[PDB]
Amino acid sequence: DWDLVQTLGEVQLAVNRVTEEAVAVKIVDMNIKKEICINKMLNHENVVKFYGHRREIQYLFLEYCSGGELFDRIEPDIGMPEPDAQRFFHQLMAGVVYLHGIGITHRDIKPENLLLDERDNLKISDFGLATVFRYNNRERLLNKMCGTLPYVAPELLKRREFHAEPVDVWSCGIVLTAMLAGELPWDQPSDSCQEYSDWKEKKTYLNPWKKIDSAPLALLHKILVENPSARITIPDIKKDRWYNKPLK
Numbered sequence: 001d002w003d004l005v006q007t008l009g010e011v012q013l014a015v016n017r018v019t020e021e022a023v024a025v026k027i028v029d030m031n032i033k034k035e036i037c038i039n040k041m042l043n044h045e046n047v048v049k050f051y052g053h054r055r056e057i058q059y060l061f062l063e064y065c066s067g068g069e070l071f072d073r074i075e076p077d078i079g080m081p082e083p084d085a086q087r088f089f090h091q092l093m094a095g096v097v098y099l100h101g102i103g104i105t106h107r108d109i110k111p112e113n114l115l116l117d118e119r120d121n122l123k124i125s126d127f128g129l130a131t132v133f134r135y136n137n138r139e140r141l142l143n144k145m146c147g148t149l150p151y152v153a154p155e156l157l158k159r160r161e162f163h164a165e166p167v168d169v170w171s172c173g174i175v176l177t178a179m180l181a182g183e184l185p186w187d188q189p190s191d192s193c194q195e196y197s198d199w200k201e202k203k204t205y206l207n208p209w210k211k212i213d214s215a216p217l218a219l220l221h222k223i224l225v226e227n228p229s230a231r232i233t234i235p236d237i238k239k240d241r242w243y244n245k246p247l248k
């Protein structure tokens with residue numbers, strides 16, 4: 001039987017006193033039905049593995065990432081070495097392409113939900129807020145507010161309904177911004193927000209943009225586009241110069 005070593009954040013670390021294997025246990029006491037459902041579909045090296053669950057309080061058995069959250073690899077006001085950021089961003093796109101390929105949107109992509117394993121491989125974690133946006137090759141627009149404000153796409157704040165995919169692309173851009181600058185550009189993406197207004201006006205001589213080399217910044221120019229139809233898609237991110245620029 002598993003022993004709960006410590007609280008990971010509730011999630012606690014469980015270790016098999018026999019095998020000695022480690023996993024992560026998520027404890028929920030009265031959405032959870034869907035988190036499990038969705039988890040059951042998932043299988044990818046950039047998504048936190050679902051092992052199983054048991055209904056005593058409901059217990060979730062998730063891959064343990066001994067690297068912690070990406071959030072804790074970002075030096076405040078500084079970010080991280082551009083090469084580590086690019087690497088994490090590649091794996092983030094792989095994770096996302098995958099989810100999107102099987103009709104699933106995470107809806108809450110942020111450094112707190114990107115975990116690292118022992119080789120610093122990046123895993124998308126927590127599908128508590130995820131949902132299906134394609135079923136039977138039929139796309140459903142999303143009508144519910146979700147996620148965190150700094151990472152949310154603007155159309156979710158001003159539109160009755162919106163496509164799922166560009167919302168995740170936007171959030172990945174903010175994440176890239178965070179990796180490369182150690183700060184978030186704005187509290188939320190509304191015109192009421194001075195900082196978001198400045199970006200729409202291309203004032204890149206301000207923070208965080210001035211801290212970001214011009215190759216990555218040009219990509220951010222394509223991702224952080226307000227019109228979700230104008231916004232770059234992932235196939236096209238895969239062809240961007242910085243994305244493909246080799247880094248030491």
Ligand SMILES: CSc1nc(O)c(Cc2cccs2)[nH]1
Pocket residue numbers: 008009011024048049062063064065066067068069115125126
């Ligand atoms: C996919 S659930 C989950 N797994 C882990 O590992 C966490 C959090 C943390 C792991 C290691 C430091 S925090 N949450």
